[PDB]
Design a protein around this motif. Sequence first.
Motif, PDB file in Angstrom:
ATOM      1  N   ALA A 113      46.156 -63.730 -90.014  1.00 39.85           N
ATOM      2  CA  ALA A 113      46.713 -62.708 -91.098  1.00 39.85           C
ATOM      3  C   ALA A 113      47.335 -63.697 -92.057  1.00 39.85           C
ATOM      4  CB  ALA A 113      47.876 -61.732 -90.558  1.00 39.85           C
ATOM      5  N   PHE A 114      46.658 -64.323 -92.851  1.00 39.71           N
ATOM      6  CA  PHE A 114      47.220 -64.848 -94.018  1.00 39.71           C
ATOM      7  C   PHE A 114      46.209 -64.539 -95.285  1.00 39.71           C
ATOM      8  CE2 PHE A 114      48.658 -68.029 -90.944  1.00 39.71           C
ATOM      9  CZ  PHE A 114      49.943 -68.141 -91.351  1.00 39.71           C
ATOM     10  N   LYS A 115      47.108 -64.270 -96.276  1.00 38.89           N
ATOM     11  CA  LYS A 115      46.476 -63.996 -97.589  1.00 38.89           C
ATOM     12  C   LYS A 115      46.142 -65.382 -98.462  1.00 38.89           C
ATOM     13  CE  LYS A 115      49.686 -61.338 -99.000  1.00 38.89           C
ATOM     14  NZ  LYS A 115      49.997 -60.673 -97.772  1.00 38.89           N
ATOM     15  N   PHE A 116      45.032 -65.960 -98.310  1.00 37.73           N
ATOM     16  CA  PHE A 116      44.504 -67.326 -99.004  1.00 37.73           C
ATOM     17  C   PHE A 116      43.639 -67.038-100.185  1.00 37.73           C
ATOM     18  CE2 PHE A 116      45.383 -70.546 -95.358  1.00 37.73           C
ATOM     19  CZ  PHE A 116      46.864 -70.714 -95.809  1.00 37.73           C
ATOM     20  N   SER A 117      44.290 -66.471-101.251  1.00 36.20           N
ATOM     21  CA  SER A 117      44.048 -66.946-102.479  1.00 36.20           C
ATOM     22  C   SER A 117      44.829 -67.872-103.210  1.00 36.20           C
ATOM     23  CB  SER A 117      44.150 -65.679-103.599  1.00 36.20           C
ATOM     24  OG  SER A 117      44.095 -66.173-104.917  1.00 36.20           O
ATOM     25  N   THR A 118      45.546 -68.806-102.168  1.00 36.71           N
ATOM     26  CA  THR A 118      46.318 -69.957-102.452  1.00 36.71           C
ATOM     27  C   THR A 118      45.391 -71.180-102.628  1.00 36.71           C
ATOM     28  OG1 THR A 118      47.817 -69.025-101.152  1.00 36.71           O
ATOM     29  CG2 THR A 118      48.279 -71.300-101.754  1.00 36.71           C
ATOM     30  N   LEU A 119      44.712 -71.724-101.586  1.00 37.33           N
ATOM     31  CA  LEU A 119      44.169 -72.785-101.852  1.00 37.33           C
ATOM     32  C   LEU A 119      42.659 -72.836-102.638  1.00 37.33           C
ATOM     33  CD1 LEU A 119      41.448 -73.302 -99.416  1.00 37.33           C
ATOM     34  CD2 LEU A 119      43.577 -72.881 -98.149  1.00 37.33           C
ATOM     35  N   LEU A 120      42.255 -71.515-102.364  1.00 35.94           N
ATOM     36  CA  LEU A 120      40.754 -71.542-102.977  1.00 35.94           C
ATOM     37  C   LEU A 120      40.775 -71.299-104.754  1.00 35.94           C
ATOM     38  CD1 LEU A 120      39.047 -68.809-100.880  1.00 35.94           C
ATOM     39  CD2 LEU A 120      38.631 -71.313-100.806  1.00 35.94           C
ATOM     40  N   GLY A 121      41.664 -70.988-105.347  1.00 35.63           N
ATOM     41  CA  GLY A 121      42.274 -70.603-106.314  1.00 35.63           C
ATOM     42  C   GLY A 121      41.767 -69.220-107.102  1.00 35.63           C
ATOM     43  N   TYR A 122      40.522 -68.648-106.182  1.00 31.46           N
ATOM     44  CA  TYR A 122      40.063 -67.666-106.326  1.00 31.46           C
ATOM     45  C   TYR A 122      38.984 -67.292-107.751  1.00 31.46           C
ATOM     46  CZ  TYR A 122      38.793 -62.460-105.590  1.00 31.46           C
ATOM     47  OH  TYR A 122      38.537 -61.199-105.485  1.00 31.46           O
ATOM     48  N   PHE A 123      39.315 -68.406-108.578  1.00 28.08           N
ATOM     49  CA  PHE A 123      39.028 -68.311-110.028  1.00 28.08           C
ATOM     50  C   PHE A 123      37.473 -68.982-110.036  1.00 28.08           C
ATOM     51  CE2 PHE A 123      38.335 -70.430-114.147  1.00 28.08           C
ATOM     52  CZ  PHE A 123      38.270 -69.538-115.035  1.00 28.08           C
ATOM     53  N   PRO A 124      37.176 -70.114-109.268  1.00 25.63           N
ATOM     54  CA  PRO A 124      35.802 -70.550-109.236  1.00 25.63           C
ATOM     55  C   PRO A 124      35.011 -69.767-108.542  1.00 25.63           C
ATOM     56  CG  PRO A 124      37.293 -72.477-108.951  1.00 25.63           C
ATOM     57  CD  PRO A 124      38.040 -71.208-108.732  1.00 25.63           C
ATOM     58  N   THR A 125      35.305 -68.968-107.420  1.00 25.33           N
ATOM     59  CA  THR A 125      34.509 -68.250-106.647  1.00 25.33           C
ATOM     60  C   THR A 125      33.907 -66.998-107.383  1.00 25.33           C
ATOM     61  OG1 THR A 125      36.476 -67.161-105.862  1.00 25.33           O
ATOM     62  CG2 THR A 125      35.647 -68.957-104.505  1.00 25.33           C
ATOM     63  N   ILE A 126      34.792 -66.326-108.355  1.00 23.00           N
ATOM     64  CA  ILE A 126      33.956 -65.233-108.804  1.00 23.00           C
ATOM     65  C   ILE A 126      33.318 -65.509-110.271  1.00 23.00           C
ATOM     66  CG2 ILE A 126      35.633 -63.372-107.729  1.00 23.00           C
ATOM     67  CD1 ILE A 126      37.649 -63.537-110.509  1.00 23.00           C
ATOM     68  N   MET A 127      33.863 -66.590-110.981  1.00 22.32           N
ATOM     69  CA  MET A 127      33.469 -66.855-112.380  1.00 22.32           C
ATOM     70  C   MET A 127      32.065 -67.698-112.362  1.00 22.32           C
ATOM     71  SD  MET A 127      35.501 -67.917-115.946  1.00 22.32           S
ATOM     72  CE  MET A 127      34.186 -67.978-117.503  1.00 22.32           C
ATOM     73  N   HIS A 128      32.069 -68.557-111.582  1.00 21.34           N
ATOM     74  CA  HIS A 128      30.845 -69.416-111.461  1.00 21.34           C
ATOM     75  C   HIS A 128      29.713 -68.789-110.464  1.00 21.34           C
ATOM     76  CE1 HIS A 128      33.685 -72.395-113.156  1.00 21.34           C
ATOM     77  NE2 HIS A 128      32.568 -72.894-113.687  1.00 21.34           N
ATOM     78  N   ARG A 129      30.066 -67.485-110.435  1.00 18.78           N
ATOM     79  CA  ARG A 129      29.070 -66.486-109.670  1.00 18.78           C
ATOM     80  C   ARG A 129      28.840 -65.103-110.628  1.00 18.78           C
ATOM     81  NH1 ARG A 129      29.810 -66.630-104.133  1.00 18.78           N
ATOM     82  NH2 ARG A 129      31.986 -66.489-104.129  1.00 18.78           N
ATOM     83  N   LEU A 130      29.398 -65.300-111.606  1.00 18.42           N
ATOM     84  CA  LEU A 130      29.201 -64.391-112.561  1.00 18.42           C
ATOM     85  C   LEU A 130      28.845 -64.682-113.882  1.00 18.42           C
ATOM     86  CD1 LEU A 130      29.907 -60.969-113.238  1.00 18.42           C
ATOM     87  CD2 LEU A 130      31.909 -61.747-114.106  1.00 18.42           C
ATOM     88  N   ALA A 131      29.470 -65.446-114.731  1.00 18.26           N
ATOM     89  CA  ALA A 131      29.098 -66.195-115.726  1.00 18.26           C
ATOM     90  C   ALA A 131      27.621 -66.866-115.844  1.00 18.26           C
ATOM     91  CB  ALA A 131      29.929 -67.150-116.339  1.00 18.26           C
ATOM     92  N   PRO A 132      27.314 -67.513-114.661  1.00 15.35           N
ATOM     93  CA  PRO A 132      25.941 -67.860-114.713  1.00 15.35           C
ATOM     94  C   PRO A 132      24.738 -66.877-114.310  1.00 15.35           C
ATOM     95  CG  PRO A 132      26.795 -68.914-112.947  1.00 15.35           C
ATOM     96  CD  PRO A 132      27.863 -68.375-113.838  1.00 15.35           C
ATOM     97  N   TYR A 133      25.471 -65.661-113.929  1.00 15.12           N
ATOM     98  CA  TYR A 133      24.277 -64.758-113.579  1.00 15.12           C
ATOM     99  C   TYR A 133      24.285 -63.847-114.508  1.00 15.12           C
ATOM    100  CZ  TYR A 133      21.906 -60.713-111.096  1.00 15.12           C
ATOM    101  OH  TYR A 133      21.363 -59.862-110.374  1.00 15.12           O
ATOM    102  N   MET A 134      25.519 -63.345-115.320  1.00 13.72           N
ATOM    103  CA  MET A 134      25.728 -62.555-116.624  1.00 13.72           C
ATOM    104  C   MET A 134      24.403 -62.897-117.648  1.00 13.72           C
ATOM    105  SD  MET A 134      28.468 -60.774-118.575  1.00 13.72           S
ATOM    106  CE  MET A 134      28.992 -62.205-119.518  1.00 13.72           C
TER     107      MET A 134
END
Lengths: 84, 51, 86, 107, 458, 173, 55, 57, 141, 167, 55, 68, 275, 114
Positions: free
Chosen positions: G23-44
């Motif tokens: 039970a830890f919320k880790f959007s801390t180390l990942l950033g959570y910004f490269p995970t979604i946007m470089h999985r959306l903007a090269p696909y859109m």
Amino acid sequence: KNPDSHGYDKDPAVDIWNMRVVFFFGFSIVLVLGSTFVAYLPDYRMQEWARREAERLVKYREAHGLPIMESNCFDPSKIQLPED
Amino acid sequence: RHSIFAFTHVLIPVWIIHYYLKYHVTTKPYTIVEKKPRIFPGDTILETGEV
Amino acid sequence: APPLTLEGIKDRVLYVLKLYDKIDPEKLSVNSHFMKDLGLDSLDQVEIIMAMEDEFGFEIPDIDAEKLMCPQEIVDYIADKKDVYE
Amino acid sequence: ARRYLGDASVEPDPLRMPTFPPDYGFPERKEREMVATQQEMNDAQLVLQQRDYCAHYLIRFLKCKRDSFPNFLACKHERHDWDYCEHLDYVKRMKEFERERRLLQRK
Amino acid sequence: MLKYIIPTIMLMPLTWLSKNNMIWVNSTAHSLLISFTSLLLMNQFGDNSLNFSLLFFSDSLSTPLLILTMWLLPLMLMASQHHLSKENLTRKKLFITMLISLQLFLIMTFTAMELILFYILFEATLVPTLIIITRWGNQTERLNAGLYFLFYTLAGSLPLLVALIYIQNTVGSLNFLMLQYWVQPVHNSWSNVFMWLACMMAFMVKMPLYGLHLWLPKAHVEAPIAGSMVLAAVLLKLGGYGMLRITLILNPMTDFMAYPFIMLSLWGMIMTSSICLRQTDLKSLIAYSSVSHMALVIVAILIQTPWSYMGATALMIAHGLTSSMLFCLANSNYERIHSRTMILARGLQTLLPLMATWWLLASLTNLALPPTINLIGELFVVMSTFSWSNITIILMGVNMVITALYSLYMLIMTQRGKYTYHINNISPSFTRENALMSLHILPLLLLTLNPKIILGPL
Amino acid sequence: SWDKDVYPEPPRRTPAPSPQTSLPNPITYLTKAFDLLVDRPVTLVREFIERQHAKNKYYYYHREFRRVPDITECQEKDVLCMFEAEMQWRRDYKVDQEIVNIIQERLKACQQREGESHRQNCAKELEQFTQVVKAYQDRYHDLGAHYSARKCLAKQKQRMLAERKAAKEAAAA
Amino acid sequence: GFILALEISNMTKNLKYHYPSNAFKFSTLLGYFPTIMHRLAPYMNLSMSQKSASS
Amino acid sequence: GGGAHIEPRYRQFPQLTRSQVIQAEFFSATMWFWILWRFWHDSDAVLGHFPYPDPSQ
Amino acid sequence: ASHITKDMLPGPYPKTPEERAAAAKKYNMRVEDYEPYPDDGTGYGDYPKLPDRSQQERDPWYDWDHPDLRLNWGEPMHWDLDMYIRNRVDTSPTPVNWNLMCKHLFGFVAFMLFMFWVGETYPAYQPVGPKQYPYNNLYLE
Amino acid sequence: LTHQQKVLRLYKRALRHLESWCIHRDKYRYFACLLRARFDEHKNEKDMVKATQLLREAEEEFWHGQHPQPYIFPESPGGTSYERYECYKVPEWCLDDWHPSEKAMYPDYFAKREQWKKLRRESWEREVKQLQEETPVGGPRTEALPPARKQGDLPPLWWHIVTRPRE
Amino acid sequence: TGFYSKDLIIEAANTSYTNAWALLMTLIATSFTAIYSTRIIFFALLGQPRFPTLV
Amino acid sequence: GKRLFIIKPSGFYDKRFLKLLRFYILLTGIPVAIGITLINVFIGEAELAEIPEGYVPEHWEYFKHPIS
Amino acid sequence: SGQELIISNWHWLTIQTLKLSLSFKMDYFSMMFIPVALFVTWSIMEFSMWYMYSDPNINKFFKYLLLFLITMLILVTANNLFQLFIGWEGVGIMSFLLIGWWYGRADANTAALQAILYNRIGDIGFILAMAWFLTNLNTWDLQQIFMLNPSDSNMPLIGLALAATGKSAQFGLHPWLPSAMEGPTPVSALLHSSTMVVAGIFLLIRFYPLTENNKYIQSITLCLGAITTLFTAMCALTQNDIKKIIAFSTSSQLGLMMVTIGINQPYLAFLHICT
Amino acid sequence: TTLDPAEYDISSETRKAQAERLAIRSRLKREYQLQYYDPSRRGVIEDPALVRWTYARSANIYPNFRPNTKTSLLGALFGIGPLVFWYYVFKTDRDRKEKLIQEGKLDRTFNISY
């Protein structure tokens, strides 16, 4: 195509001379001496004339009475100027 | 030596690059465009304190 | 820069036999076949290289399980992977 | 900036001033102002935000930086005295809210 | 041209007159010798103007553009010999003679002294190109593409004759561009729309808009022996320049209806380069690069007032040398793997190390790395159409963004490995393969020293 | 060289030094050695060419043109006299480019020579230059007929609008 | 931070043996910004909006 | 390989070359001598302060 | 040069079991989840009967994949489904669709209400009311 | 993937993702049998849903809390410096065209080159003869007989037998 | 080294007309720079030697 | 001992090439280099003001350069 | 004594009114920054003499590092905004040839594709302010721009701010740095300590005689500098590479230095990079 | 976020006779390896999975195509769609920009370029 000879263009002999007709004529005479030709080519678009002629004409007007950058309608009262 | 390796590298172009510089300030109507001396009142003025 | 020979791989595999307290220094050297004293189904197939998972442990894929029964067959293809002896 | 009158020459970059532009100036004690010489302040190549108070003491301070060229400190105590010129200037300015909190109260 | 046409016709009874396999060395020898004579009397001065001899030349005074037309016959014969040498000598003598016969009419074109001498030479081509398209290709879709190359160029160019003969008996005679001192203006009417429109639309069919580009990835995709007329067809596209000769004068005051040509060719620019990143045919990858930053000149000519003619001239021969070489990079590396599929040519950059520089210094001219002839061209167009409206920096800026990701996608497909196949692909890029890949960048970066030679009037 | 009235500068005004200390200064070690190492291979070679170049001389002359016709000549259907009036005219626009280049370098002259104040001093450049560029695009720059350069077919007709619209139609000037 | 890092690092070392707590919320180390946007903007852009107005 | 001047180990702690520790201990001394002008003499804020300027009347 | 089953035809209901596989082994016996029925969106000329599209997707997973190669480097025989967007694909992450990234910048979106104020050091908030008077109250004297 | 080795591929990673979570060395090692104790609950029973609830609830508490950027064993499918040795990359058999005076070097390696090719150039009378016989019609994975009943040559000869060494 | 760059700027934001959330974002970040230090100490420079063998 | 044999693909043709650029570029480049060196020393141009050219001026060769 | 020198060397082409030739600049950032940055590069090659000790491709890496320094050093010496744009995009292509040093490894040159991508978004602001200077001030020599300070500089400088965030790794363009470290070590020892990430803030430092006014500028810059601090702070914790930990700490030093332009301290800003 | 991606599911015994789908790909690989190994090939293998990938993407879309839908007539929202919008912007500038340029002034004295 390699029968382990070198080959340039087509085959063994005088096709060997096809390199020294493309290397010697292509560059090394045209890309050197012709590149030298327009390196020091004479006064292009007559600007070298204008450099010194704009250099001279400033200080003559700047001396006594003639202003600079007039745009004086090219000697007016030769224009009759039709009103309407 | 440290004699012919070092002297060939730096000493020759400074002879070259100076020659296109002293023969150049009198030809081009703007040379290097040096600023002023930034002098304090220690030439011909008072100080005057420390009042 | 450091090279390697084949006399070191014969010892480390043999040493971690002795490092395990489940196995005595009375089993065979190169081929006890791991069923001589197997058990269980799990933890005698992947745990037997879980000590070398820390030591050598270059991620050891899914094919490495049932080849590892023959304890000489472990020693066979480690030399194939890491560019080893001649 | 203590005077609000006209400027004779149209020279911008507020050297066209009454004499010298302060930060606020003067205002009460003293109600006066003054500074160095503007003909020397332009003779000295010195930027704006340096024509304020304690400039004449600084114009003699930084002169010894070149007048003692291979030096480490021209005068370190005068740097503490120019700061003492600066700190006495600034605590003179700090008495705004000592007054403005009280002088805006009723009487 | 006093006599540049007169020696280059004398090249033609030299080829058939020759012996056996000497026919390659005899033609390429003398064809280089014109490059001194081409430079020789031309590039003179220079201040209003050089009318040259007679009714046959205004010397191509303020737009040089013609020295590049004379490199190519001693550039294509060394390129075409890769897979041509299986046919008969009787047809090998043909394919050299019609290629010279294409250079003959281009020489009296670009100079042309007139506007009706232009058209009959503007249409004097398209017969020797079509022979190189239909015969000497590969497997089919040559023949429909031989018909798409017609019927766009020829349907548009016939309403020139209706308008150019109309001018010749309306206001004096068009025979000189220097009898164009008396020019009546062209106001807003319902007949003067069509006079502007028919005189313009036949130039749009060669340098394409976003519409009617449908013939351009047809002739270039299915294409002769080793880019052999594809090098010619890229010059011929930019040899529809004559809008610079016409529209500067001769209806000067119609910008009122420029707007359906602006927005179609300014939004099409940002899309027709974007529509190429999923190409699978390698020669069709380059064929859409040639659409995009050629169509930047169409918004650079219709917007007048130079600082654009500084750049719109430099862009005609910007990719005159770039897009030629990219076709030569793809006319090579097809002799070894017999597909133009870009998937298949992987495992490279280890096998052919010496031509890695030839990939990059090609694709570093689209990134364009400002001291070249390229970003001295675009940055005058950018600083021109900024002064039309400020908003045009957005679309033209995203034009600069996508072509950065576009050019590298052709480079980076060769930086992989393990090659999986290919007992062939042995030939280590022989002496000819680097020679005809050179003489492209060797003048391209050379002229960046003093590029006052590449400028309009201006 | 040139003449200094075209390219002005004030005098240099390098002051008297003030060492004042016995602290070790490296300036005596620097200029008193390295100036001689460059003095031999430069001054001796430049003088050696200077006599060798004074062995023979070569000549090139001033090129001054003839200005008989000026502006409003001639009749409409003429070609010849309306060719000379454009050969007159285009030389009066390549030159008037470069006079703006001269005055702009004059603005470059003051600002790197003063630098610190640079605004309240030199008194002249921002007054002179903006009375020349504001006297440039009016009547001498076909904005926006600059594309064809429109010699005498439009160069008079900005200046027709500077007469037919200006100075009478101001209601009532 | 010298006090704060050590008393957590020793809490990672010499505490009461914290469980391997999922039970830890880790959007801390990942950033959570490269995970979604470089999985959306090269696909859109490269998939939908390129197969739209290409062929 | 060619020269085994630093041997590999089986966790027996291969040591230093008995000269690296001299340069190692030399550059802890040069920085804690350099705490000289941190305290002697440099204070927290050598500016002087205001003694609460309330009596302004 | 292969002419028999060169490509698709106007499908995708032209007796689908005959397509995969006459050649183009997308399905084994037309029940493989890749029988050439998938013309999704007929009326579009894109993807006919087509031993092709809407097949399972999102990656060549770019890992071990060890028959020999099986993914993207080493080229298996007939596995091309749709490509040129699978050059560098990824996979599911540890969370899913809790967009805290817009919520991360929402902290300064609340602190845009701190952009309305100033940051003057002297004095503090000063709970007096209309006795702060930040510029001027009265005259020179 | 059989149910016998279905837990095993999960069992290798259950401890592997654990050791990226610890900070000590014994912290992992004190938790060793402790992690094994929950895995040793269901030892010997059926293979149906009676025992699939070991796995059907192993989705939680394994995927829940699964390896926050774990250790990756850098020479692997993932991880840094895995496929990095590629500037060399061993382009084996690039030695076809030389135009010699470049075949002067290694006179013994080129001597040994022509020796090994006889196994490569001549094995098709033997290996391909049984290859139509040993493979019945279209059967599964195409390894030959592991000695090929007299001399395995190879079948994988020579691209898997003389393949690229790493350095 | 950079005491004459670091301290003189955070005490140049002392008297300023800033966002007042800026000093609540710059000076808080300075505290986070301290746990950067001991982290590489506490994992690479502190603990018991743990790594696979052949040192 | 630690030893192997590296595999480098092809270098002879690239060493047989790169000569013919560097060979022929000096064959007329370096003879043109003295022509920019020696002609500088002995030949220049001068100066200004003006001359009045007599009655009829000079022809072409109004320029101020050795070869121009 | 000072005596700063710009020069006038050699003419490029000259068009209608504006002449550009080339020059140099020697004021407070040429006579200070150049020996500092060059002393590091003197010290860094000896590492790569031992770090790249075994590579047979050795000579390119001591050649491409040399061209990288020249087009880095031509930027700070330039007084010409065109000469900046040469050095602005000379350093960009040097990244692509150094992140993608090793062939293969399909995450390596994909990161090189991401490396040149965010520089071109970082390009579009710089060419915007290049356009605005001709249309008003007839030139872009940095002397004449500082003669009269332009009145409404709201249009060009926001473009200069967006180009500043291109190379200097601000928020919105932050993920370029942590995956650019995938090359060899003295690359990233030179690519992100002394070069290529302090150049993005350096362009604003040279434009101090414009940026002091126009209150829309300063509040956007200093609020931008604050966001980059804690977003690089709370991303670097629980992170498991040495080089990545250094990759965030070099990004969080920027978060101070971007604020140093907002509060009008130009020389305190530059003095940080020298340290 | 694009996508789920369904990395574990159930089996045993939903259609247990589904096996020998590997017999397809083992047949191909036995066909390929016997094709790939040979002493004299000197050239690529055809592998028509590529041939059916280009030719069903390059051609065979327009012989396929019928305009029976309105999702292929959707392109008027995409082809002529934004091109309408760019005309609407550019004539509001150069007209509002034009009147300010004539009626009144906006640019300064030192605007020679342009």
